[PDB]
Amino acid sequence: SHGPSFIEYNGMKRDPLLDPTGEPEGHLWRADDNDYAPNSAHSARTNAALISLVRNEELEDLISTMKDLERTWNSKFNYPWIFFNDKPFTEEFKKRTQAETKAKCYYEQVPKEHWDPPEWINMELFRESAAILTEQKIQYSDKLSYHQMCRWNSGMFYKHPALKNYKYYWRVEPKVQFFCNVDYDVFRFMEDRNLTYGFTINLFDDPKTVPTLWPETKKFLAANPSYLSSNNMMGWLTDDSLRPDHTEAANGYSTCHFWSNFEIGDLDFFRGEQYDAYFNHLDRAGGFFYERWGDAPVHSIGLGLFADAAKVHWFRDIGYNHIPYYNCPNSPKCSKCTPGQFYAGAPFLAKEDCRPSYFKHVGMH
Ligand code: NA
Ligand code: NA
């Protein structure tokens, strides 16, 4: 039912999002039953934050996003927002953002050591490979800052001092929509079930951004044979049954990833020995700069090799859009999205959905 449609792969045959979509099973923490007052010192909030890497120039898009997340969820639960940027935030940014929430907002700067390329990266080699990716990649002109963002999301955000006393994060990107009321504390949902990571969308990537990522991953695994988890996603990570040319071009990796612009995650997974050693291996290999290794594939591979797959959750009930893709469930809590419509735009976008592989090899839990 949830398997692949072919005409050539052309997306999902029957999207599970069409099924009546409700809340997860088990105990759920409700706002009407608990102290979630924004300034209460004895609230039901766990140690979690909404986080966003965002520039001053993206303020208007951020405000639209905050309005959706607040209306659908955070106006009831009042978790804090923590904003990150390599430059200082303006007073206008601070005033406008804090005006959209009753929760506390924090404004943080990424340190130089978490943003500047590391010493071992040769900037001439960077510029040469960037010129080639610029020539090859569709609707793409390279910038150093894209690579710095990917590296920051991959290995640095969870080392930031501001997050030291936090265990969970919900990553939010400046220009996104949320469509569905969510009436339970998602952070404590994760905590009570010892969940590691939550996603809404699962996509193929551009193999040109990651050609040596899987080869470098295999080198890391050969050097650290005890790191591979028992409940791993090797079948999903190495699948070639939907788009075999992607898997060939990325040298053994399907390119499939959790679409990391949305994440709800356990910071302590990424801080752990296994994932962080993986990140540092990749950091030394140089592919964050000499290629364009995305934080999405890097997170997805890390989770798929080192996490328990039973602790990774599809948040099917969180209606979500980041252009051009959607997670829109069939629920009366949602509005202004079409249930089960994966994409908006030209029909060639349909094949970018990797959930039929993820659901086969890992599951829909
Ligand atoms: Na309450
Ligand atoms: Na290009």
From TrEMBL:
Q: Which GO terms describe its molecular function?
A: alpha-1,2-mannosyltransferase activity; metal ion binding
Q: Which domain of life is it from?
A: Eukaryota
The yes or no answer to whether the keyword Isomerase is present is no
Q: What's the short name of a Pfam family annotated to this entry?
A: Glyco_transf_15
GO cellular component terms, semicolon-separated: Golgi apparatus; membrane
Q: Which protein are we looking at? A: Alpha-1,2-mannosyltransferase (Ktr4), putative
InterPro entries (alphabetical) = Glyco_trans_15 (IPR002685), Nucleotide-diphossugar_trans (IPR029044)
Q: Which family does it belong to?
A: Belongs to the glycosyltransferase 15 family.
A GO BP entry is: cell wall mannoprotein biosynthetic process
Residues involved in Mn(2+) binding: 173, 322
Keywords from UniProt, A to Z, are: Glycosyltransferase, Metal-binding, Signal, Transferase
Q: Where does GDP bind?
A: 53-55, 58, 85-86, 140, 146
Disulfide bridge map: 180-334, 256-354, 328-337
